[PDB]
Design a protein around this ligand. Sequence first.
Ligand code: ADP
Ligand code: ADP
Ligand code: ADP
Ligand code: MG
Ligand code: MG
Lengths: 240, 370, 370, 187
Amino acid sequence: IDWTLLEGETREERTFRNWMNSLGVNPHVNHLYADLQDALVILQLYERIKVPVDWSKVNKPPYPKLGANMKKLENCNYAVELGKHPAKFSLVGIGGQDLNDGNQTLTLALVWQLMRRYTLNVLEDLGDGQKANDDIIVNWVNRTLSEAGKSTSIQSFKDKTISSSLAVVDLIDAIQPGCINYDLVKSGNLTEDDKHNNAKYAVSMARRIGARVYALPEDLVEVKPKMVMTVFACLMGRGM
Amino acid sequence: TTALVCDNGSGLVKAGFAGDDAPRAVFPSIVGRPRHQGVMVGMGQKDSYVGDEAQSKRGILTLKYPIEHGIITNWDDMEKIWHHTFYNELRVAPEEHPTLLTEAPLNPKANREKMTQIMFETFNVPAMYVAIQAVLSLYASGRTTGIVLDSGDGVTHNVPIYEGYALPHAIMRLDLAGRDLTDYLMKILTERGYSFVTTAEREIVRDIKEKLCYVALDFENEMATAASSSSLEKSYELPDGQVITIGNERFRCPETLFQPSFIGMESAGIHETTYNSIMKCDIDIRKDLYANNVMSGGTTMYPGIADRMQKEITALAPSTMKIKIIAPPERKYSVWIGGSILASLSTFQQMWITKQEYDEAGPSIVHRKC
Amino acid sequence: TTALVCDNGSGLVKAGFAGDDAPRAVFPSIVGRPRHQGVMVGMGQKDSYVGDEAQSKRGILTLKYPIEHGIITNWDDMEKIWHHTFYNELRVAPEEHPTLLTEAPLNPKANREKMTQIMFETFNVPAMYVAIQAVLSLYASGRTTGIVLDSGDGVTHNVPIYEGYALPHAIMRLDLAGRDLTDYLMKILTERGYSFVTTAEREIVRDIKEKLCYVALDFENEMATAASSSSLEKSYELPDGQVITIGNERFRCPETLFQPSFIGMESAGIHETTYNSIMKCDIDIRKDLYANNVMSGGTTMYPGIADRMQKEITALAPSTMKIKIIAPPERKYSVWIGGSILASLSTFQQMWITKQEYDEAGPSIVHRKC
Amino acid sequence: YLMKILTERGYSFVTTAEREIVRDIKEKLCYVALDFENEMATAASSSSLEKSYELPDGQVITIGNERFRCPETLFQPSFIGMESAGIHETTYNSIMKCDIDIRKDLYANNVMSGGTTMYPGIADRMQKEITALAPSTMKIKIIAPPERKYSVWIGGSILASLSTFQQMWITKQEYDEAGPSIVHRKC
Ligand SMILES: Nc1ncnc2c1ncn2[C@@H]1O[C@H](COP(=O)(O)OP(=O)(O)O)[C@@H](O)[C@H]1O
Ligand SMILES: Nc1ncnc2c1ncn2[C@@H]1O[C@H](COP(=O)(O)OP(=O)(O)O)[C@@H](O)[C@H]1O
Ligand SMILES: Nc1ncnc2c1ncn2[C@@H]1O[C@H](COP(=O)(O)OP(=O)(O)O)[C@@H](O)[C@H]1O
Ligand SMILES: [Mg+2]
Ligand SMILES: [Mg+2]
């Protein structure tokens, strides 16, 4: 999996790009402001957030050399239309030509609301209905780890003890006993730099078991509380 | 939960998060609409242009400001700017952030009531607050005593504060600010044959304002200097490549601040308005106010504005007081900077208007809590 | 099923199916009638000749163009050409295909109305549309911004477009095109003793013009070059074997495009008409119009006409703008190519003038929907 | 603009000599509609608004709808692609920029002058349009004398014949000293 830093890219764009690739879009998104201009990736993300897409209204990536830009512009008009009425997003002053031109501000104004909807859906299928909560999912890991029994228990997502990936790799094998693999884990001999390696070591296998984790390893080394809860929310679905 | 600080003025919107030292989003508060005929399919779908996009495509748009002279005159286009601020420029859900808003003094009471109703019933914020801009500009300077001269795009107001106490009877307000200087520069540019008429050409004149205009230390000697020589002439390139030259309009445009009769107004200049505000204060606090004149806003950014206020007030003061103008280089964001300071204080966390209070008192709650 | 794209120019007819990259049928827009006496029995049964057969038998015919300067002047001959287009050259039943037609701007309104009534009542098409030729040329270039110079057989016109919006007040139209250049080449060919009078001989001069004529980069030094030497001389073989030679008339003929006073017209050249059309646009959109001067039509196919335009507009532009003329090799069919792009779009499928709408509003429906 | 919309009927005027013909057509056949949208519906139904004009070569042209669409640009400058407001709103906006005490006297003295104010129905239309913008208790009074075309000349002969004006001339001696810039002080 690609974990590299571009010359110019903010941390906000890295999170959105990584969330796209980790979600399984048909192309590989390398640049946000250059790979979304035909609106095919955006229309794919609408399916992942339970928004119906009529694929008879979309122009397929084989494009004629004559009128190709008008074919892509029709796709961007459909993507913005689907964001307003059925997706119920707030897209004020945004038209199809803003995505087609790669407007940086107005492209991020749409993708962040896609990601917010995706995380909201993750927090609702974990429960019975329209309830989404953080402390229900924090004592679940403290309970399911007692089945095997290990000295990893956290109070909340803001705890600094999850700075190293020892707490999340402790949970990655509780659901699946076939992924023990403590060969490359570090315990007690970790500096600030070497815990980047095990953070990638922990996130990478989460997709092997089936936990569709879309958080950066940097979101785990630091204690960003909004992205680390997604890691545990995605692990609960694979478990239960 | 981090608080939001939206300082929306007549000209610009300043938005960001409480705790930072500079606003994250600074865009013109305009809404553009297409005035021409759309012929190519797939291109006429956008009905409104809000942020810097309305400024990018102003050639085919009519540009409207929703705020005039501190007062919101178009409440349907004001919600577009707030939707654009929260979802496009900041990319936050307003339902999770208390929002700090600003307003000029001596402003209609329906303006403050209706922007309280919009924040609670449309954006559904957890809490909100409306702050006076001149007070927030005093937090930014790290003071509790001084008289603030706030000059933005629509309103010039003076507020004297002593030991953290405001003197409301000495608060001044002059409806002459940057936008009226723009319209005066358009009018006097026709004396050289340069005609600017459309709303998109007013943005070009505002740009000439902010780059070429300055304040004369002595208006009558600059007028005689520009008449004789040609050393004050300067050139400017229009978007289409034409070059215009102005030599005398550079300092006559900001001279309207000190002589409001240039645009047919009976009011006194900003130097005699700040002095009249001091003389309405108690005689004991006047010496402290004379030494703390705090300027903020874009209209106080002209080169020479602070050296002219120093000279003009000194001529009115009793000659034993020492006059001190405080003009920090970050003047343009003092209202926003001081609002991020205020919203970060733990003492302030009980001063929010929560939704529970609004649900029992309606929009009128804002009058007693603010 | 599939849409028909028919570009009825003054000189040529371009027809085909939407979705193709080139017209299937390109034939002259003429109708010929015999002007001599038929003496062999069974050979004079044909009363009119329409397409390329009117051109091959032109020695015994008088040739009439139904369209002159973009306006259909003969409506019985126009129905002959449309019958030839649908039934003989494309070989389709018009009752099964929506038809897209084209028209120049600033054209009489009865022209558009009559071709709407012809298509619905004579050919019984299910739907139709009339588009502007310069708008379609922008589709072919894959652009939504730029000023189009369309020059065919009858009309030269300019249409500025910015971000898919047209500025109709800046649309400029000139009734000087190829057929006027051909008639001027006939007039100046008599200086060397070559006389062409017959309408069949006018088709010969058009063939000479399309082969030997070119635009001089500097007209006054080509005249001095051709006066002193014979390096510009070129030969042409007439259909009967005679050989004519022209050295000076090669560039004096297209020079009428830039100096319309050669044919006694008071108008300005195509370089000044384009510049005047840009200067009628908003000052903000002028830089993008200077950089996209799209050329279209057969009268722009002279060798060296884009180099001459780029030199002439540069002399009129403010010397800071960068001038760019886009002259694709497929210029002759840009109007048709753009029409097939438009009729293929699924977002265009609701803008056809359906026969149902025509039955309740009559031929005037075309003014609202187009 | 009349030239531009005459081509909708097939009448082409392109030369500077033909523009003088269109000016003559405008001055003889154009009028201001009291209500634009009702005159447009009237001309679209019947032909009672049609009128004919004879060109210098004997050709006869007919216009029925361009007669009032040409002067309508004064009240809707968007016809010729301009963003400005009409002459009725520009007049109202000039009053609203004046002191509130002098507005009642300005509403009652709206003086028109010049040839472009000579269209039939121009004063009735300005009367109706400003009334819709005025506070409904003011009295709108348009003053349109039949000698409108020379009001600027007539008032200049009145001014130049006054004896008090005789000291306001810019004499040659004054110009010989201050140069051409003297005109900015005395006028
Ligand atoms: N460098 C400058 N010199 C002079 N005026 C300026 C400069 N920069 C901005 N301005 C003026 O400041 C105004 C905007 O100031 P701002 O403080 O944002 O007002 P508001 O609080 O109303 O948004 C504009 O009208 C502009 O004319
Ligand atoms: N290569 C060429 N050089 C010069 N003139 C040409 C050339 N090809 C075509 N023309 C001229 O262009 C005209 C036809 O152009 P076209 O755009 O097909 O006209 P229309 O728009 O009426 O169909 C004819 O008058 C012909 O003489
Ligand atoms: N009866 C009329 N109806 C409509 N327009 C007129 C009439 N008479 C003159 N005009 C127009 O008014 C103008 C008269 O010129 P004038 O008022 O003297 O202008 P100026 O003061 O610029 O010379 C001309 O342009 C003419 O087109
Ligand atoms: Mg302000
Ligand atoms: Mg053509």
